[PDB]
Amino acid sequence: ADSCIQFTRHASDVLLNLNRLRSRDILTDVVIVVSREQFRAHKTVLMACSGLFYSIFTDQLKCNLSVINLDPEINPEGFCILLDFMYTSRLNLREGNIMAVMATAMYLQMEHVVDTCRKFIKASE
Amino acid sequence: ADSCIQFTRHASDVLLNLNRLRSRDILTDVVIVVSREQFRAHKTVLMACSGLFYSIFTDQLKCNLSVINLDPEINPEGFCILLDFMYTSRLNLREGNIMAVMATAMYLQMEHVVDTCRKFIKASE
């Protein structure tokens, strides 16, 4: 309908509550393994943020897996920063992690993160 | 970290993608039954929006149910409008549905919706 009203803060409040569920380990349904570091998450949030996870969890066989192992070249801290960004909209981008975050965002197909990483790197060159 | 950058549109893009998953029936894990009308949804989104669903899906027995039957006094159209609001931030509030939406929001413990309904009713009195 064209007659709707909108609650401005709704989407951020939903994201804040999904993050709360993740911290309390409520209804998490997948473990992402990155070089033996394990991260519990919600498949729907991963699919909503990452082109790679969207492709994974829409596959008729992988949709049922409770563990997903990422490529061993992926940095666990880079993945952690990206998972926090998925659940909070905030990216902890630092000189010491930018290359790992950018490489991880390229792999996860998170184009907005790749774009800001490219801009920060270009600014330092 | 206090050094984070934030992507303003992230939370709304996540919500838009969760709604897309719902429309395509991807990874929906519960059917909410309202007077024999059935609504497929994601438990995490319901818990993130509604105090009632948060209480339901954090219960050690109900967390495992794939069907939840609501009170027969709940109006299916009112529930539909609220479920759409959960997934989009947009509330289709109309003269013909406001009482049903308000009663449903009180039952689902969705205080911001109850508040706008009270304001619209008070304005017409």
Partner: peptide
């Protein structure tokens, strides 16, 4: 909050 989107 509420607005006209």
């Amino acid at each position: 909050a509420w607005v006209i989107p």
